[PDB]
PDB file of C-alpha atoms and ligand atoms in Angstrom:
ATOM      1  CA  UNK A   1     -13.713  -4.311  -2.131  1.00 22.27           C
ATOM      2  CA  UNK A   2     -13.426  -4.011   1.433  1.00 22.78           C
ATOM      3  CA  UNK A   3     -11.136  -6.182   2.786  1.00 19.51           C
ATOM      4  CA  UNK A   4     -11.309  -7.847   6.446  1.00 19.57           C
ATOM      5  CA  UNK A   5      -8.588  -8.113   8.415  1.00 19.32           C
ATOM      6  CA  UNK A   6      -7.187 -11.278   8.298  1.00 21.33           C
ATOM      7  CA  UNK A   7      -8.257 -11.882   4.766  1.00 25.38           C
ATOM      8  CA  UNK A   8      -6.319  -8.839   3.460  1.00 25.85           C
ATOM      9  CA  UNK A   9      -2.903 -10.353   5.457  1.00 25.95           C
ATOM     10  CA  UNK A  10      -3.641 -13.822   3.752  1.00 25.61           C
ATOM     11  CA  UNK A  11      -4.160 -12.099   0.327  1.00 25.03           C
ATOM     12  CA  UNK A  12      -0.515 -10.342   1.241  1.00 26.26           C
ATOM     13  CA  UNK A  13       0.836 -13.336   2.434  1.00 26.61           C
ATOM     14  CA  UNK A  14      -0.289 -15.138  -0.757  1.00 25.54           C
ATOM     15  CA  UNK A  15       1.199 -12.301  -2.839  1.00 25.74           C
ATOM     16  CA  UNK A  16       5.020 -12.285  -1.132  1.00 25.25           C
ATOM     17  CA  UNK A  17       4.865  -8.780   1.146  1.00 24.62           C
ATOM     18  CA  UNK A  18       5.646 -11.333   3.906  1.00 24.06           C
ATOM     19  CA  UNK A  19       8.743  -9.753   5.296  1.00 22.49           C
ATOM     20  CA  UNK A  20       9.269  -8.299   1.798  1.00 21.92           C
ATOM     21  CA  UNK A  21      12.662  -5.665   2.562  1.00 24.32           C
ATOM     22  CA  UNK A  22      12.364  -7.020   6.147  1.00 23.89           C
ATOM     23  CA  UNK A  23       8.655  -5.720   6.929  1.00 21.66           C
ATOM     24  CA  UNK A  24       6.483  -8.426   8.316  1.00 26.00           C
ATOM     25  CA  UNK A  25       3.173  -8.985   7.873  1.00 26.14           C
ATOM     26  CA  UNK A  26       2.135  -6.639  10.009  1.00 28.16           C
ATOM     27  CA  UNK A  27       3.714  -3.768   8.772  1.00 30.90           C
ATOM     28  CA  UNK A  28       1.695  -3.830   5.511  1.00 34.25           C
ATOM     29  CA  UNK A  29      -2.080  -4.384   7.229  1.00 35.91           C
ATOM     30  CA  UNK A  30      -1.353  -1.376   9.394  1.00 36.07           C
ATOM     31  CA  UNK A  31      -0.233   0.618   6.741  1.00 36.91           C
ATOM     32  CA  UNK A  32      -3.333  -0.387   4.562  1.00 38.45           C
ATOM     33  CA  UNK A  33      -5.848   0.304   7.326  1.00 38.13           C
ATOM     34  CA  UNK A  34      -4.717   3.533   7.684  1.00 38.33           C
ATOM     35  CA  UNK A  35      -4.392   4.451   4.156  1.00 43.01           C
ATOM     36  CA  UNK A  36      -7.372   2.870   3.420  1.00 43.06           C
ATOM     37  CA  UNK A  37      -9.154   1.575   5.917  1.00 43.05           C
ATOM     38  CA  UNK A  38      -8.829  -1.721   3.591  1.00 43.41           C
ATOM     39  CA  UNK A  39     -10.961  -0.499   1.045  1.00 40.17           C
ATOM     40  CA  UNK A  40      -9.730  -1.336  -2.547  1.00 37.53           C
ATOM     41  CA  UNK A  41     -11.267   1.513  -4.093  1.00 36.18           C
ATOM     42  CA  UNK A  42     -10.145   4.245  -2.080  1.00 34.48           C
ATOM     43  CA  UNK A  43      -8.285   7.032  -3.706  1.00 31.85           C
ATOM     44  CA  UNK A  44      -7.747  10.850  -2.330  1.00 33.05           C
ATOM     45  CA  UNK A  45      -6.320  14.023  -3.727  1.00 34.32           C
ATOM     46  CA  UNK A  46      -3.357  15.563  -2.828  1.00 32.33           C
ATOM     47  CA  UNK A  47      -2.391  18.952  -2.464  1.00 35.80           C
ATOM     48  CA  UNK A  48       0.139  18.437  -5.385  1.00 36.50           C
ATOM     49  CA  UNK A  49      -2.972  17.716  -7.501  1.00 36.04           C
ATOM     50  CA  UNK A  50      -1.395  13.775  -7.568  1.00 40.81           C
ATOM     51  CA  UNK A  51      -3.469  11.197  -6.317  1.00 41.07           C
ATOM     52  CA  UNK A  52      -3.337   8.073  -4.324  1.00 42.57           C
ATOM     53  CA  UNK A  53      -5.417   5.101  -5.224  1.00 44.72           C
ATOM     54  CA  UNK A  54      -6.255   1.625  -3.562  1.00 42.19           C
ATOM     55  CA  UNK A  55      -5.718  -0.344  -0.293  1.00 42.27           C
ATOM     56  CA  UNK A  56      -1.881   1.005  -0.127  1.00 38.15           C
ATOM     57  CA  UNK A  57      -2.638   4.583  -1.556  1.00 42.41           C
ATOM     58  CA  UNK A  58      -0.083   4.844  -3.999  1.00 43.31           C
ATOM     59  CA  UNK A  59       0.488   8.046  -5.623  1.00 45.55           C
ATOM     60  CA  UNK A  60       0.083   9.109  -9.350  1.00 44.59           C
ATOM     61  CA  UNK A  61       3.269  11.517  -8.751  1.00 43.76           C
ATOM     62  CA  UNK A  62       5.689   8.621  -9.420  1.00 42.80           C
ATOM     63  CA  UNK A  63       3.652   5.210  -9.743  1.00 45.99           C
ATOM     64  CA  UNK A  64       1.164   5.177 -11.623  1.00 45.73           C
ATOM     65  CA  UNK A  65      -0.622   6.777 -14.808  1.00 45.28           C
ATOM     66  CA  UNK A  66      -3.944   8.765 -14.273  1.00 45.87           C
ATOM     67  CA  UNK A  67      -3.566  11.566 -17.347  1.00 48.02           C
ATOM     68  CA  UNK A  68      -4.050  14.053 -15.043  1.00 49.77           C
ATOM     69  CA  UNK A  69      -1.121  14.352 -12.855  1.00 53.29           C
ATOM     70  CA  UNK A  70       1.271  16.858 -14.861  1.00 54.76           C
ATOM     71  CA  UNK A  71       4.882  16.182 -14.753  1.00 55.30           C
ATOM     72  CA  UNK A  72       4.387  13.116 -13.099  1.00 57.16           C
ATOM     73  CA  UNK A  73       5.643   9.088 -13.732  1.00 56.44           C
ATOM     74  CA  UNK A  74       4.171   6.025 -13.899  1.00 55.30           C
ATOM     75  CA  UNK A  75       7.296   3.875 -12.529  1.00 55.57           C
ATOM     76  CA  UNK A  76       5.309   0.975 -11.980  1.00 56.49           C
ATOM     77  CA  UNK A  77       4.309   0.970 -15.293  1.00 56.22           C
ATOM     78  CA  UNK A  78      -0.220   0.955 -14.529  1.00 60.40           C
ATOM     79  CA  UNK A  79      -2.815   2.888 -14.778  1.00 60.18           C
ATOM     80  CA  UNK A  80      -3.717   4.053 -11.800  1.00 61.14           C
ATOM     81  CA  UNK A  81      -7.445   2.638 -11.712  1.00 63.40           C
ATOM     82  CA  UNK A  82      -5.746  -1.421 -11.533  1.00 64.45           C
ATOM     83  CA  UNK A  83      -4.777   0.212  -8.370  1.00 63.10           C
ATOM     84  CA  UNK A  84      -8.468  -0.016  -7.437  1.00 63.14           C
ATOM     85  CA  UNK A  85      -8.954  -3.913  -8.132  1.00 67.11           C
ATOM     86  CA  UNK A  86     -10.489  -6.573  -5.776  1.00 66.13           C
ATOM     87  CA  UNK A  87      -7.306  -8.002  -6.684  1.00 63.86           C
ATOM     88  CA  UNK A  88      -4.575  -6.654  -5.126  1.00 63.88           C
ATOM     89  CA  UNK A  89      -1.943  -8.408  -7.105  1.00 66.97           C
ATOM     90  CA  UNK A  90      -1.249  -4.692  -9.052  1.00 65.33           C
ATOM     91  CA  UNK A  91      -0.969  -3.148  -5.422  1.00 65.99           C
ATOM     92  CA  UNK A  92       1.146  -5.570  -4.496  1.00 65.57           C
ATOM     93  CA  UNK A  93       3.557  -5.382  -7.564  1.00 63.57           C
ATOM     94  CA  UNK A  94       3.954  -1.813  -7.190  1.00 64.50           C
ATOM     95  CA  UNK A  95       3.922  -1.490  -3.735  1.00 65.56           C
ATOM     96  CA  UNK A  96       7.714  -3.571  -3.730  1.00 64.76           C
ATOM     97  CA  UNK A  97       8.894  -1.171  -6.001  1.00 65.07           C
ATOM     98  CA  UNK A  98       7.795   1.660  -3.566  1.00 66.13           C
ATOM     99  CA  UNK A  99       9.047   0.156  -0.591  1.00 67.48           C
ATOM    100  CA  UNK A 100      12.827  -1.096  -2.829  1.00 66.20           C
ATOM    101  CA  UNK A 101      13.120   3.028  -3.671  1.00 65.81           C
ATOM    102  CA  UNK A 102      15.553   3.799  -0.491  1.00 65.90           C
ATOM    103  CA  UNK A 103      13.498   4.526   2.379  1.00 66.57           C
ATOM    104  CA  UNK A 104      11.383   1.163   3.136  1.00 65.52           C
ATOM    105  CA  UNK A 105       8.231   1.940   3.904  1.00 64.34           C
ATOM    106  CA  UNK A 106       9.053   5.764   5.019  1.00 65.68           C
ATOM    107  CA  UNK A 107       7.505   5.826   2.024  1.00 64.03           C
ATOM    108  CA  UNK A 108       4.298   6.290   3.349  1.00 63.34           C
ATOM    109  CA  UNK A 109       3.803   8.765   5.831  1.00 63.71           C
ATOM    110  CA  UNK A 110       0.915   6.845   7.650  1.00 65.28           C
ATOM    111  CA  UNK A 111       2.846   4.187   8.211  1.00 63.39           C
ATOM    112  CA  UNK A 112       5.974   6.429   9.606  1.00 62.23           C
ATOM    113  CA  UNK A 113       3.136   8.466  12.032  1.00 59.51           C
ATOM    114  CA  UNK A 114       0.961   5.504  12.983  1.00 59.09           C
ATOM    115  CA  UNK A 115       2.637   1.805  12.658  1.00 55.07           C
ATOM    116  CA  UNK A 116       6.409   2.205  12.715  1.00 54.59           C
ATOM    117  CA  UNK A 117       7.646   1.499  16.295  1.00 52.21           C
ATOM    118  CA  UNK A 118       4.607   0.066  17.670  1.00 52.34           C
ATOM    119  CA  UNK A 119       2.871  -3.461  18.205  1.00 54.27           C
ATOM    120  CA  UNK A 120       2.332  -4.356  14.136  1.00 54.13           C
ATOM    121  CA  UNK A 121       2.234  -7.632  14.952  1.00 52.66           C
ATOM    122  CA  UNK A 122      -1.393  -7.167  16.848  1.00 52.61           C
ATOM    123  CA  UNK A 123      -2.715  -6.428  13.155  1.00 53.10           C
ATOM    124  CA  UNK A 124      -2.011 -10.103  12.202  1.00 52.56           C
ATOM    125  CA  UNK A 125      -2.962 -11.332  15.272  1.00 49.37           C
ATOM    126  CA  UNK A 126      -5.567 -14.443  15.663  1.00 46.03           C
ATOM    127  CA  UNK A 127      -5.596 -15.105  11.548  1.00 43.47           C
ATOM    128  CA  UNK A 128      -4.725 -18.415  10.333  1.00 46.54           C
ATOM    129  CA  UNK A 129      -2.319 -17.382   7.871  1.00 47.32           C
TER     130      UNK A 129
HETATM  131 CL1   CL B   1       3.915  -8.722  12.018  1.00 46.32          CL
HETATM  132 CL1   CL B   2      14.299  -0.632   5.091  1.00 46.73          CL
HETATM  133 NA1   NA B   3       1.769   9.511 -12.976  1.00 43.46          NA
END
């Protein structure tokens, strides 16, 4: 599923990442539309050989299951293809475990290069939420 704007920040709103560890609203739409341009079924390869799945790309290396990520975890306890849902209630889940694990959303190094520091609110802007 591709997601629209607003409708992914109400489906986060709905599903508590609302200033979840401090980060507003915001915060989590620009990460996901740089991860994944707010596609649900995104997923890429890294150079690790992990992979990162769904709207919030979360990797195989420590979150999820995919069999084919050697040495790796599964911390949120998923495969990695629920990652992939039109419901983003297992993205969601997981993602406040990623984001509780010491560095906030450092976590993910799009939103470190491309939202932290700047206007996140404008993502959020003009929804009724
Ligand atoms: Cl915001
Ligand atoms: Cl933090
Ligand atoms: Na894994």
């Amino acid at each position: 599923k591709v997601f629209g704007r607003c409708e992914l920040a109400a489906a986060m709103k709905r599903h508590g990442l609302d200033n979840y560890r401090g980060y507003s609203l915001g915060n989590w739409v620009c990460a996901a539309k740089f991860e994944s341009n707010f596609n649900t079924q995104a997923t890429n390869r890294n150079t690790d050989g992990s992979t990162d799945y769904g709207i919030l790309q979360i990797n195989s290396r420590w979150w999820c299951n995919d069999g084919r990520t050697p040495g790796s975890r599964n911390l949120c306890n998923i495969p990695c293809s629920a990652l992939l849902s039109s419901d983003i209630t297992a993205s969601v889940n997981c993602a406040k475990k990623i984001v509780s694990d010491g560095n906030g959303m450092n976590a993910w190094v799009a939103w470190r290069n491309r939202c932290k520091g700047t206007d996140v609110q404008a993502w959020i802007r003009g929804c009724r939420l």
